[PDB]
Coordinates of C-alpha atoms and ligand atoms in Angstrom, one line a residue:
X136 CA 147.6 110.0 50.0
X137 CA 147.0 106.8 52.3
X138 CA 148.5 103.8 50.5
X139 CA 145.5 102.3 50.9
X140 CA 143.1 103.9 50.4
X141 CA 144.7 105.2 47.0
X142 CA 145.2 101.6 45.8
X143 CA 141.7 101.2 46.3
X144 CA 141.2 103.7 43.7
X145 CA 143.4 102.9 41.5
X146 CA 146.1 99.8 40.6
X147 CA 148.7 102.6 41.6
X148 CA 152.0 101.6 43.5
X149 CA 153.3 105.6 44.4
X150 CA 150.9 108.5 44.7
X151 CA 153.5 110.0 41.8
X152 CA 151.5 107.4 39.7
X153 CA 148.6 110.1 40.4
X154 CA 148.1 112.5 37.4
X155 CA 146.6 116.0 38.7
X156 CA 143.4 117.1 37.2
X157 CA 142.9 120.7 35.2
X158 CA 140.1 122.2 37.0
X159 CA 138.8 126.0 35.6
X160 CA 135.7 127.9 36.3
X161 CA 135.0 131.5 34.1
X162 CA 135.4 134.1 36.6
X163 CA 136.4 137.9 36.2
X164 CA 139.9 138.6 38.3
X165 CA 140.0 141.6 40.7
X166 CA 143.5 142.7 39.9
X167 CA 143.0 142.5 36.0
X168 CA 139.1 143.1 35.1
X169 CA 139.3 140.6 32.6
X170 CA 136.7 137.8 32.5
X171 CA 138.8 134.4 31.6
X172 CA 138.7 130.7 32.4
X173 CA 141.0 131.1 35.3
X174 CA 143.1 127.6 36.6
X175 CA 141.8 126.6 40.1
X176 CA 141.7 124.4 43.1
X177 CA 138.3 124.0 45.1
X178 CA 138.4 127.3 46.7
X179 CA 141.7 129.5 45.1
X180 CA 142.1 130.3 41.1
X181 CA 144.7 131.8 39.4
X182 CA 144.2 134.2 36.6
X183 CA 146.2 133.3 33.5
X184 CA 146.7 136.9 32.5
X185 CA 147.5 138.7 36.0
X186 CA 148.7 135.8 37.6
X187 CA 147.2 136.9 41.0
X188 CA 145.6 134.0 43.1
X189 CA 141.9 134.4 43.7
X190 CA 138.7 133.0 45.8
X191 CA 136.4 131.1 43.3
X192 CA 133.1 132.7 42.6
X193 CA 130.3 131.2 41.2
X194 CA 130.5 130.3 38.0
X195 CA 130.8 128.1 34.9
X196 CA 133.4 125.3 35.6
X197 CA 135.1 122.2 33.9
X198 CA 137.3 119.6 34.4
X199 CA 138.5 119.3 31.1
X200 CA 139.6 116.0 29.8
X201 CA 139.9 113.2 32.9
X202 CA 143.6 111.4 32.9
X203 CA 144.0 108.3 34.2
X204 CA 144.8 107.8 38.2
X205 CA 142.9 111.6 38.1
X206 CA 143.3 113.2 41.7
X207 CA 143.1 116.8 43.2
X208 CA 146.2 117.7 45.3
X209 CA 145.2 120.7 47.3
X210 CA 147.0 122.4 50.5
X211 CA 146.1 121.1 53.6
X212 CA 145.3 123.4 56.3
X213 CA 145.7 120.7 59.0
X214 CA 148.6 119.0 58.2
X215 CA 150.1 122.5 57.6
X216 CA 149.0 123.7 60.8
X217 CA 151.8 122.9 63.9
X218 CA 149.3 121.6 66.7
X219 CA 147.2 119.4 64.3
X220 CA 149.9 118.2 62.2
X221 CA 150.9 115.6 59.5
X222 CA 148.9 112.5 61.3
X223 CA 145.3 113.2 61.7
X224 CA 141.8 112.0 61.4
X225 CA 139.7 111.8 57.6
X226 CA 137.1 114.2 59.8
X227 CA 139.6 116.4 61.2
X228 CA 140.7 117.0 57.5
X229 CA 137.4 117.9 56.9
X230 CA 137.0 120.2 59.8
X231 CA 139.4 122.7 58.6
X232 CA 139.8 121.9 55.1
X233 CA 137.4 124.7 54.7
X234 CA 135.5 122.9 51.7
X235 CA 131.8 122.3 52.8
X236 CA 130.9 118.8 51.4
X237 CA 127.3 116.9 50.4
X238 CA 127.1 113.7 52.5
X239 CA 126.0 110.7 50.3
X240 CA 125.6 107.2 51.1
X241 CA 129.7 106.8 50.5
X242 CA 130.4 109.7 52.6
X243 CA 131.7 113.6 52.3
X244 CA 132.0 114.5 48.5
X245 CA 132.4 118.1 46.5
X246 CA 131.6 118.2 43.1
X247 CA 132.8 120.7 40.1
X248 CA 132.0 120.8 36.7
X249 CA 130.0 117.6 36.4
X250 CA 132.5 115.3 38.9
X251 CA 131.9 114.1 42.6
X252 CA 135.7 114.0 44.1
X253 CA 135.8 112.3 47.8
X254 CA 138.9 112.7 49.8
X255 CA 142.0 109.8 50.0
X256 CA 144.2 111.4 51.9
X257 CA 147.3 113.9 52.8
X258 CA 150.7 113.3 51.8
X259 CA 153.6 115.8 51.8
X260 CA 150.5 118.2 53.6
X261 CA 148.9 117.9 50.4
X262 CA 145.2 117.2 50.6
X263 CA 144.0 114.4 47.3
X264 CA 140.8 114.1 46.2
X265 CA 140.0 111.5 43.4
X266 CA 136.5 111.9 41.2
X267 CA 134.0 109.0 42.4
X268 CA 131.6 110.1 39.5
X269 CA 133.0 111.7 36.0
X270 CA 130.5 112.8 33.2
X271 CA 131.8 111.9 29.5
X272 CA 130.6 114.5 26.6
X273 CA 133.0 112.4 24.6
X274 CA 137.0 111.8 24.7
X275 CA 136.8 111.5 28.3
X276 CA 135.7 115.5 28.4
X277 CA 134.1 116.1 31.4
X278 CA 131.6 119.4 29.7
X279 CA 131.0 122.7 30.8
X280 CA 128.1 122.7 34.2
X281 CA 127.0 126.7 34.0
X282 CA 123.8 129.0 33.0
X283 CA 124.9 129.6 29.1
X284 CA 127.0 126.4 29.0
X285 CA 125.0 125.1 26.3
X286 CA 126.4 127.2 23.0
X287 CA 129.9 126.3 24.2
X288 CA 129.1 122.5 25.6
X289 CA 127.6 121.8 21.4
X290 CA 130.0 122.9 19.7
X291 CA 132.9 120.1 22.2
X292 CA 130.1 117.9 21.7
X293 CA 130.5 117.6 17.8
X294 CA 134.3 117.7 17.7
X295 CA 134.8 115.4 21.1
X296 CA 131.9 112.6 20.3
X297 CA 133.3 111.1 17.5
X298 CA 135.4 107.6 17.6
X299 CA 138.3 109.5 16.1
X300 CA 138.4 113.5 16.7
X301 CA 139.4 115.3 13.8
X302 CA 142.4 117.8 13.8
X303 CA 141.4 119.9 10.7
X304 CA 144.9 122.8 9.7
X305 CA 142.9 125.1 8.1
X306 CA 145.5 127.3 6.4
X307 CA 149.5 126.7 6.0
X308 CA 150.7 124.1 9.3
X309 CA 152.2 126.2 11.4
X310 CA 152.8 125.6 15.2
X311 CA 151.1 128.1 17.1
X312 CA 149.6 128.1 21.0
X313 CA 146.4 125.2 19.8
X314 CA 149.4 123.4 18.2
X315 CA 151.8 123.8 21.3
X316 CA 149.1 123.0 23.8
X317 CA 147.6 119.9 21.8
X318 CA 150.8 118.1 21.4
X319 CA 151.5 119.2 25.1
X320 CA 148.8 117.2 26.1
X321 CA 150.6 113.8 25.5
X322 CA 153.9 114.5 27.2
X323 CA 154.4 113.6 31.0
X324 CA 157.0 116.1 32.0
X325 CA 157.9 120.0 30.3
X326 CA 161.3 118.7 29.5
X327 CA 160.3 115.8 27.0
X328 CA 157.4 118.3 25.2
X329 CA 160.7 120.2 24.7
X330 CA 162.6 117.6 22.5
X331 CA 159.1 116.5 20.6
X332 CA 158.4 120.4 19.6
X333 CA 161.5 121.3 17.9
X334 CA 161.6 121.0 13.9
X335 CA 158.1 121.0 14.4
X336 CA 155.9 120.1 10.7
X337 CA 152.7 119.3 9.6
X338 CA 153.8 115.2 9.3
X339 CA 155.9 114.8 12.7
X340 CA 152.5 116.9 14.3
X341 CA 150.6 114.6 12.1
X342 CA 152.8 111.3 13.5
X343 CA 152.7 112.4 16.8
X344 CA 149.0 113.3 17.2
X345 CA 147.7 110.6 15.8
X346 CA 150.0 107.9 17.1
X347 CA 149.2 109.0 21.0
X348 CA 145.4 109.8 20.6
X349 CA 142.3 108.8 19.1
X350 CA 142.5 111.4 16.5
X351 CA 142.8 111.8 12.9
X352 CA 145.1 114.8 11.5
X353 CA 144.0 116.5 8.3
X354 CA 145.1 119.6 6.2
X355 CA 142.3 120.3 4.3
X356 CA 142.6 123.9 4.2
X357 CA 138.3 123.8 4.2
X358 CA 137.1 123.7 7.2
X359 CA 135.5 120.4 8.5
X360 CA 132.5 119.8 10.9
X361 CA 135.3 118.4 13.4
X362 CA 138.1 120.7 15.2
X363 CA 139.8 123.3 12.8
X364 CA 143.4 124.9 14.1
X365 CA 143.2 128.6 11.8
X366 CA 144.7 131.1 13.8
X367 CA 144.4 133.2 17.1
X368 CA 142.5 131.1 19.3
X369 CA 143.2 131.1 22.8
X370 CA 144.4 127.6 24.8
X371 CA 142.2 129.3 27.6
X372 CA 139.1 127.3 26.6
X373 CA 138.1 123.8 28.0
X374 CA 138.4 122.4 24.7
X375 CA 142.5 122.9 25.1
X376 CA 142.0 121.6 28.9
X377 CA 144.3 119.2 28.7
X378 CA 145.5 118.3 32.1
X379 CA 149.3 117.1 31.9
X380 CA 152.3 119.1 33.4
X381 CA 153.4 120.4 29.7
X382 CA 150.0 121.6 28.9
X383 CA 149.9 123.5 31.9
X384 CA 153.4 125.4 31.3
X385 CA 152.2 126.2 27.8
X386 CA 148.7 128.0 28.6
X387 CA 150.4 129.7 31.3
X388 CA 152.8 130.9 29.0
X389 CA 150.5 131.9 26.1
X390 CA 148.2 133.4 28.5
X391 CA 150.3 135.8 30.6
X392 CA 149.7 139.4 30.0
X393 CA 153.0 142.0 30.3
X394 CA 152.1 145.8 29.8
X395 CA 154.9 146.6 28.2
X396 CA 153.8 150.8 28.6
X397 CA 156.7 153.2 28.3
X398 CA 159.7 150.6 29.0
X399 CA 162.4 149.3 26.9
X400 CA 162.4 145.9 25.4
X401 CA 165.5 145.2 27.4
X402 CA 163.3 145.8 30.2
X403 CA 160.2 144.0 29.0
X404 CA 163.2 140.9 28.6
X405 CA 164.2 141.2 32.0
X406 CA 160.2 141.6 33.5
X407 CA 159.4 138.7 30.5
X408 CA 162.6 136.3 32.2
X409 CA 161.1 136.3 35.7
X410 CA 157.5 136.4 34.6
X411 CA 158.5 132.8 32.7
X412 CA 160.9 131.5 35.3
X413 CA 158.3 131.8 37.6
X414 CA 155.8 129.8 35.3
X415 CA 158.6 126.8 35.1
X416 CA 161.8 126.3 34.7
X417 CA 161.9 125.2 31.6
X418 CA 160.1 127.9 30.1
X419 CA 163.1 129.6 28.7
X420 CA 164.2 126.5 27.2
X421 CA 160.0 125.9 26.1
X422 CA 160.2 129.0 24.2
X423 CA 163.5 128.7 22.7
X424 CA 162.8 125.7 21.3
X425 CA 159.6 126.8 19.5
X426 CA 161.0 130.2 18.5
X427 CA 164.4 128.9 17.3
X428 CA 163.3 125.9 15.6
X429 CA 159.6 125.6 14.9
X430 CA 159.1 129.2 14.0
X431 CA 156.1 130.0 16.2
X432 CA 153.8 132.7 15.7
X433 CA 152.3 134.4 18.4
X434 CA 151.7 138.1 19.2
X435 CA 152.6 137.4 23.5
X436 CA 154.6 140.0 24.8
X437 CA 156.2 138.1 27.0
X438 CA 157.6 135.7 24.2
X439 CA 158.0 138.5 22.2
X440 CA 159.9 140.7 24.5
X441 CA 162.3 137.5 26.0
X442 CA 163.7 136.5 22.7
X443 CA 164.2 140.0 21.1
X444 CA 165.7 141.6 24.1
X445 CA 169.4 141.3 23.2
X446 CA 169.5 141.1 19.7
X447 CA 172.7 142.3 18.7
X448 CA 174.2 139.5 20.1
X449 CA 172.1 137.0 18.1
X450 CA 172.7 139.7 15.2
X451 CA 176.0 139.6 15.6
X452 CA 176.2 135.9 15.8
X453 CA 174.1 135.8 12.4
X454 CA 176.4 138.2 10.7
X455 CA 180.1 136.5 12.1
X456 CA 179.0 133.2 10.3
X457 CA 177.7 134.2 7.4
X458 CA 181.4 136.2 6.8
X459 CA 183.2 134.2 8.2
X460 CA 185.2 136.2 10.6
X461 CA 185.0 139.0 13.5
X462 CA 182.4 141.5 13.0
X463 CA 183.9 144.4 15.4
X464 CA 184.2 147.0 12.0
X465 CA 180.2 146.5 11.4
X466 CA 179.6 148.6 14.7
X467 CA 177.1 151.2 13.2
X468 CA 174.4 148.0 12.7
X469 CA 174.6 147.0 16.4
X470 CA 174.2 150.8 17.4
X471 CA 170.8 150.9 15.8
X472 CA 169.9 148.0 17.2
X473 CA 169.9 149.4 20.5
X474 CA 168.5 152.4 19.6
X475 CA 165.5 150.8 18.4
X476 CA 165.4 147.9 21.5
X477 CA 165.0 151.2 23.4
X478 CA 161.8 152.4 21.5
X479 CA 160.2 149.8 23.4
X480 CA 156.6 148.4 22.1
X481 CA 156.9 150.2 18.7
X482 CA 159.7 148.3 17.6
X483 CA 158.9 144.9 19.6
X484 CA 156.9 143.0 16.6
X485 CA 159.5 144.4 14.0
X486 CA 161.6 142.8 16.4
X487 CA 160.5 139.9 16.3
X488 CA 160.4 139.4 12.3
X489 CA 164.1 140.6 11.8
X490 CA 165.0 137.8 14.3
X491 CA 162.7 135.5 11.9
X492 CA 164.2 136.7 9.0
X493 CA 168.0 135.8 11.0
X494 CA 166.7 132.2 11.9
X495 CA 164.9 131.4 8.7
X496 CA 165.7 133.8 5.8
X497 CA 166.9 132.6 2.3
X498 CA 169.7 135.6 1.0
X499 CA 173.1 135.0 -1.3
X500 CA 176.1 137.2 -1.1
X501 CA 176.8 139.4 -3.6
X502 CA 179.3 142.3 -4.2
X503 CA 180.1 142.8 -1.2
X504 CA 176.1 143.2 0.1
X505 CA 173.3 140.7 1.0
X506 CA 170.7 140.2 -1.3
X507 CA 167.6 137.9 -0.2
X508 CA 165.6 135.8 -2.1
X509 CA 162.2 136.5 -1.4
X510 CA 159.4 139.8 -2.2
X511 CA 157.2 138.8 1.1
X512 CA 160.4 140.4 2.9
X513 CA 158.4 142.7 5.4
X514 CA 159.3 146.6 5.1
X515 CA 160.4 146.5 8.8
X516 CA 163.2 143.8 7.6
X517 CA 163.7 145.5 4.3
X518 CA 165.5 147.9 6.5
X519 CA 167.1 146.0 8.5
X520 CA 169.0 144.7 5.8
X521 CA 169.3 147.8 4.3
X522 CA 171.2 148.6 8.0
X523 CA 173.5 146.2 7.4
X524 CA 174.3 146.5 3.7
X525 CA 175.3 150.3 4.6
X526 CA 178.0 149.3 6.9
X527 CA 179.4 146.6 4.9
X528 CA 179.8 149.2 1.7
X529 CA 181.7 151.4 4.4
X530 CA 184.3 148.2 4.8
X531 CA 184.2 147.9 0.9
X532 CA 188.0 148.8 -0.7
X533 CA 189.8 147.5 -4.1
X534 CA 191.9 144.6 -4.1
X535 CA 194.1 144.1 -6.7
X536 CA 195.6 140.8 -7.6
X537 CA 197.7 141.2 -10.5
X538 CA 196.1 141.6 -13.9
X539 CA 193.1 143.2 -12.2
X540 CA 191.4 145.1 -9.4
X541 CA 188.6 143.6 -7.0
X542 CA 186.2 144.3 -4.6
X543 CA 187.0 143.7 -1.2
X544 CA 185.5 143.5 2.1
X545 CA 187.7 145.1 5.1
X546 CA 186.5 143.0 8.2
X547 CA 189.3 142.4 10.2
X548 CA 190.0 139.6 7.2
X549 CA 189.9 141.0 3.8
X550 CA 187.8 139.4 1.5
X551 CA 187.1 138.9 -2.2
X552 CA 183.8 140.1 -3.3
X553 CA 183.7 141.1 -7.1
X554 CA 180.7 138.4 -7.0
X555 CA 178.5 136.0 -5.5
X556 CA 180.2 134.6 -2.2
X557 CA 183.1 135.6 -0.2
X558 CA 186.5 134.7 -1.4
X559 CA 189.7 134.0 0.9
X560 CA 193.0 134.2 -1.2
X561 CA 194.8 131.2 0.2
X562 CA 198.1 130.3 -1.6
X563 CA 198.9 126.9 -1.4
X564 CA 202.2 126.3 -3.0
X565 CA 203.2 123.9 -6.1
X566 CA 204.8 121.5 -3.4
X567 CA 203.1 118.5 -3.1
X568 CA 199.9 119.9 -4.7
X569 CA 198.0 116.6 -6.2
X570 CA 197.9 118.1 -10.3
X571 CA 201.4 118.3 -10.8
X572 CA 202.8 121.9 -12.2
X573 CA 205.6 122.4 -14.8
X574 CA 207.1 125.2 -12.6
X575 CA 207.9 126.9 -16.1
X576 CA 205.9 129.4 -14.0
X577 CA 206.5 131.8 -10.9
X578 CA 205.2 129.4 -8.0
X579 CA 203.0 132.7 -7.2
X580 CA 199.8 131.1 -8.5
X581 CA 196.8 132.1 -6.1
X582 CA 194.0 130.2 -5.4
X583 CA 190.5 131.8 -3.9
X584 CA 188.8 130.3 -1.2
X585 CA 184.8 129.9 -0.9
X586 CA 181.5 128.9 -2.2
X587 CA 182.6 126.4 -5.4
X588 CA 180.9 124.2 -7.8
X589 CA 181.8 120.7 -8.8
X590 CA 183.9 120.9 -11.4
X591 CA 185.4 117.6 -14.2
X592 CA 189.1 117.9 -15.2
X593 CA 189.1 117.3 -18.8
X594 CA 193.3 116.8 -18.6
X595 CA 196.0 117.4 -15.8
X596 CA 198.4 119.7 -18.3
X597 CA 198.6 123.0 -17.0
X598 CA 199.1 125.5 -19.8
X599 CA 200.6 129.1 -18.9
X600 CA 199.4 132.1 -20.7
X601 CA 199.5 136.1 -19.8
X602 CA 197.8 139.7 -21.0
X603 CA 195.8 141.4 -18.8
X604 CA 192.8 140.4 -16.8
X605 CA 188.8 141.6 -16.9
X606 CA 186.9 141.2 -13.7
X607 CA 183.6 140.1 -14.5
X608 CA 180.0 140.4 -12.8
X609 CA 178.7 137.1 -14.3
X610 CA 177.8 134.2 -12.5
X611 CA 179.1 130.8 -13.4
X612 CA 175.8 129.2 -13.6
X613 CA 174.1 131.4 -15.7
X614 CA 176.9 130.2 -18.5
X615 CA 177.4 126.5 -17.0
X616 CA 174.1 124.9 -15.8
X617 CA 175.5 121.3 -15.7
X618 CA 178.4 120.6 -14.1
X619 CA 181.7 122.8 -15.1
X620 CA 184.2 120.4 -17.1
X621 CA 187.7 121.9 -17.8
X622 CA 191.6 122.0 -17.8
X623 CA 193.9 124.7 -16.3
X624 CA 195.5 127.0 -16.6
X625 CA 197.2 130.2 -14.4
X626 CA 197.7 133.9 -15.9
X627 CA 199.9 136.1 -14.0
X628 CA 199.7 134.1 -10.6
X629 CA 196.4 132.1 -10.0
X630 CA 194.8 129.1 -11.3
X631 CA 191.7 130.1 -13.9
X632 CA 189.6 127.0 -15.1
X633 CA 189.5 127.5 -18.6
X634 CA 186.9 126.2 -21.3
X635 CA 188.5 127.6 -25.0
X636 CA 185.6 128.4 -27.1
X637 CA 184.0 130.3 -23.6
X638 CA 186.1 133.5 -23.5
X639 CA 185.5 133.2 -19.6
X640 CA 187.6 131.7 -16.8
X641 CA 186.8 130.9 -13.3
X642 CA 189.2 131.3 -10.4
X643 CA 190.0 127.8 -8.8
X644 CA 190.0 126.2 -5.2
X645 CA 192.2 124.1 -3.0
X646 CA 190.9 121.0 -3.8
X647 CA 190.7 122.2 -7.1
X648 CA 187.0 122.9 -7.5
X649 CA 186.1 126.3 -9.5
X650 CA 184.8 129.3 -8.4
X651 CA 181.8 132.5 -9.1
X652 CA 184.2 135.1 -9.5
X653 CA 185.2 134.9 -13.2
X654 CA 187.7 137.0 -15.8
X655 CA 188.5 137.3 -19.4
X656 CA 191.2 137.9 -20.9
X657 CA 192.4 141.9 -22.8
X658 CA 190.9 142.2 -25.9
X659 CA 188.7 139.2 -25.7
Ligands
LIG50 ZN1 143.7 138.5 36.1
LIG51 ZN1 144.6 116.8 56.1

């Protein structure tokens, strides 16, 4: 506010140096029946649900854990007002500031949830109030002031007393809304709690926490007599209020509450977009960033409905570089995408674990279909992939290079898929080629590009040899574990890396590295 009278506060050179206070009192909103710890000012509070501004009542308030340079900035009715204006008196302020004060020895104060603020100043019409008096319950909490504060105000008292707080993961780490909103805490601005939270894990939240706070991280999964992070706890309680910027966006974020009633999840996405724009403008980026690369749970709709709105372009995305090519002949999977987006609420949490599975799910290629790794694959994405595996057997057709016939994979770029991975059939001709080639032989030898082992090249003779050629299922691993070793050799057209007591070849690669799909020879 007033230079001066702010620098008598605090050894602050800009009232930006000021760090605004989380203030919250538990009050039922009009417009949403729901009884939360609502965000407020002295008179106004916003419900974290709803959203809708309302007049405090009385009730159980806190000021959550004081920052340093701590001040209220409230609107100034004064300033605001055209007759009055921008210069005015400390009493005139108080005249229409509508906020009846107690007169003490120092002069006009207002107190809230065990602090005494006074008032500094206005600047840019905004009203500051700093606390002269601050209770501690421990870690600069402020408590809980209210008739059945007590329950609540014991159990802050045993995490927050303690020299060193202790962050206790229960289960698995895994960053949800206590995660987001604890980590929040220590970052000045929404855009740098953006950077820290991606490739979130238990040791960078375990680096992070205890480098910027006096706590002490630990993943016993028992539970401690100090603060344990399970799961589905709300950041709408004074023990997550944390008063920074960051903070603020993510309990706004994981508290508001979208009906998502008979509409689309397109719908919901665009109601979720301005909902969250609304909130910050880096919320969309906030909630990337967590989705994308921290793999958040949460069950918001709003969150929910933002990132799975769309879809089939991140589905298509997903499938164009895992194949390697245009995706325009899988049409039916994107259909049924947006028949179920339509659905609405019904399919808005299978949503969300299909794009789960897209971001973090562990599959291989193989003939032709994609086969994942894991049993824990939910039903709702056991069909998804069963979707997609339909349409690529509909773009399934037989190659056949000479000596033998192969699965292939129509897709606007025909692909080799007798086996494990997808195989391009680049020809690279004799000319130049680094083993050097007798060119007894047809300079027709094919090579098959794709997914390739190290290989050792026992010697550099190349050795013709022809019959006719066996496709086989078998995968190179299961008969070479250690590195393949061999010299060789091209039947009818193609290099095959050959091993003579194995009756099995395998295809070769430019660069010269060998290959899954693997033949035999007629007869063996
Ligand atoms: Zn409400
Ligand atoms: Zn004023």
């Amino acid at each position: 506010g007033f230079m001066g009278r702010i620098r008598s506060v605090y050894p602050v050179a800009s009232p930006q140096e000021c760090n605004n206070m989380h203030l919250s009192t538990l009050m039922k909103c009009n417009h949403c029946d729901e009884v939360s710890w609502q965000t407020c000012d002295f008179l106004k509070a916003t419900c974290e649900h709803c959203g809708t501004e309302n007049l405090v009542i009385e009730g159980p308030t806190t000021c959550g854990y004081l920052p340093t340079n701590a001040v209220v900035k409230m609107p100034c009715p004064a300033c605001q007002d055209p007759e009055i204006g921008p210069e005015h008196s400390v009493a005139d302020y108080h005249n229409h500031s509508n906020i009846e004060t107690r007169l003490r020895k120092g002069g006009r104060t207002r107190c809230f949830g065990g602090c005494v603020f006074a008032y500094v100043g206005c600047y840019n019409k905004r009203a500051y109030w700093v606390p002269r008096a601050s209770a501690d319950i421990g870690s600069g909490h402020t408590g809980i002031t209210g008739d059945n504060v007590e329950t609540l105000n014991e159990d802050l008292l045993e995490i927050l007393s303690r020299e060193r707080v202790n962050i206790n993961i229960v289960g698995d780490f895994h960053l949800n809304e206590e995660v987001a909103i604890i980590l929040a805490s220590f970052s000045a601005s929404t855009s740098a709690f953006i950077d820290t939270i991606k490739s979130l894990d238990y040791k960078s939240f375990k680096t992070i926490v205890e480098s910027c706070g006096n706590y002490k991280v630990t993943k016993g999964k028992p539970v401690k007599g100090a603060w344990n992070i399970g799961q589905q706890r709300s950041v709408l309680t004074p023990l997550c209020g944390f008063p920074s910027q960051a903070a603020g966006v993510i309990r706004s974020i994981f508290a508001r509450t979208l009906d998502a009633a008979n509409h689309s999840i397109p719908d919901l996405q665009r109601a979720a977009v301005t909902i969250l724009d609304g909130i910050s403008e880096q919320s969309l980026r906030l909630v990337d960033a967590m989705v994308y690369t921290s793999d958040l749970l949460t069950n918001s709709v709003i969150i929910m409905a933002y990132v799975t709105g769309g879809l089939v372009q991140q589905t298509s995305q997903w499938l164009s570089n895992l194949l390697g090519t245009t995706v325009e002949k899988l049409r039916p999977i994107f259909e049924w995408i947006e028949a179920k987006l339509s659905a609405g609420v019904e399919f808005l949490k299978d949503a969300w674990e299909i794009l789960k599975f897209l971001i973090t799910g562990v599959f291989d290629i193989v003939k032709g279909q994609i086969q994942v790794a894991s049993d824990n694959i939910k039903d709702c994405v056991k069909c998804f992939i069963d979707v997609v595996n339909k349409a690529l057997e509909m773009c399934i057709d037989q190659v056949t290079i000479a000596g033998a016939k192969l699965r292939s994979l129509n897709l606007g770029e025909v692909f080799i898929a007798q086996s494990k991975g997808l195989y391009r059939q680049c020809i690279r001709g004799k000319e130049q080629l680094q083993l050097l080639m007798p060119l007894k032989a047809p300079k027709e030898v094919t090579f098959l590009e794709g997914d390739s082992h190290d290989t050792v090249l026992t010697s550099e003779e190349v050795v013709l040899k022809n019959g006719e050629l066996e496709a086989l299922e078998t995968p190179v691993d299961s008969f070479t574990n250690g590195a393949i070793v061999g010299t060789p050799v091209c039947v009818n057209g193609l290099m095959l890396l050959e091993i003579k007591d194995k009756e099995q070849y395998c295809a070769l690669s430019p660069g010269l590295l060998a290959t899954n799909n693997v033949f035999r020879l007629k007869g063996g």
